[PDB]
Amino acid sequence: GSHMTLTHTITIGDVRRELPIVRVADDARIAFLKLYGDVELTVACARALAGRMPADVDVIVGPETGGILLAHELAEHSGRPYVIARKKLRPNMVKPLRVPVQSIGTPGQQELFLGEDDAALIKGRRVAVVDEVISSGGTLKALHELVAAAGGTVQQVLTVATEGERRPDVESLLHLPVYTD
Ligand SMILES: Nc1ncnc2c1ncn2[C@]1(CO)O[C@H](COP(=O)(O)O)[C@@H](O)[C@H]1O
Numbered sequence: 118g119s120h121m122t123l124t125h126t127i128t129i130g131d132v133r134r135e136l137p138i139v140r141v142a143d144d145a146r147i148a149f150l151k152l153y154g155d156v157e158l159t160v161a162c163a164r165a166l167a168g169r170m171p172a173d174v175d176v177i178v179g180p181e182t183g184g185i186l187l188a189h190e191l192a193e194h195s196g197r198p199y200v201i202a203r204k205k206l207r208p209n210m211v212k213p214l215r216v217p218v219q220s221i222g223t224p225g226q227q228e229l230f231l232g233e234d235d236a237a238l239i240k241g242r243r244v245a246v247v248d249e250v251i252s253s254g255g256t257l258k259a260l261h262e263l264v265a266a267a268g269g270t271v272q273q274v275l276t277v278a279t280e281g282e283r284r285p286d287v288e289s290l291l292h293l294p295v296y297t298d
């Protein structure tokens with residue numbers, strides 16, 4: 118006569134967290150990673166990922182919202198510039214590049230954008246793509262497409278966690294299983 122409060126333990130260096138295992142579909146729960154509100158976890162993840170980012174990387178690119186904190190802290194740690202691909206058109210965007218994000222929960226709607234200034238910062242550079250979690254990979258594919266459309270090359274993919282499928286072409290800190298409902 119009560120609801121589940123099950124958790125999944127992660128450890129980034131010696132930052133330990135208990136991720137709540139929460140329902141997201143008829144038949145599925147995930148260990149939910151919350152960087153918002155957690156400076157210690159955010160900085161530890163960004164430090165660990167920067168340790169894995171080679172000197173070849175020119176620029177960091179992350180999506181709104183899952184790459185905001187990580188890209189900022191990676192850039193602050195490494196000295197590399199970074200770019201956020203936005204979810205909405207903003208008035209400072211002239212001639213934006215746009216890609217659809219493949220998504221199972223609600224197709225068609227999801228989009229990522231680069232203004233021509235963001236794009237001018239990516240053109241011709243080696244890019245590390247970063248996002249907090251990679252699950253289906255739709256977000257990651259859309260970022261690949263945006264980076265290609267802007268003239269850059271994805272050299273590395275950085276994430277705190279893969280989820281569901283394991284991804285050996287990805288630099289991740291851990292793997293999160295998907296749980297039943
Ligand atoms: N366990 C999770 N804890 C936090 N956030 C998660 C988790 N699993 C997926 N996410 C998010 C949001 O739902 O999914 C995006 C990628 O989804 P995709 O690879 O299919 O395109 C990420 O940016 C991230 O925000």
Ligand SMILES: [Ca+2]
Binds near residue numbers: 190193
């Ligand atoms: Ca900082």
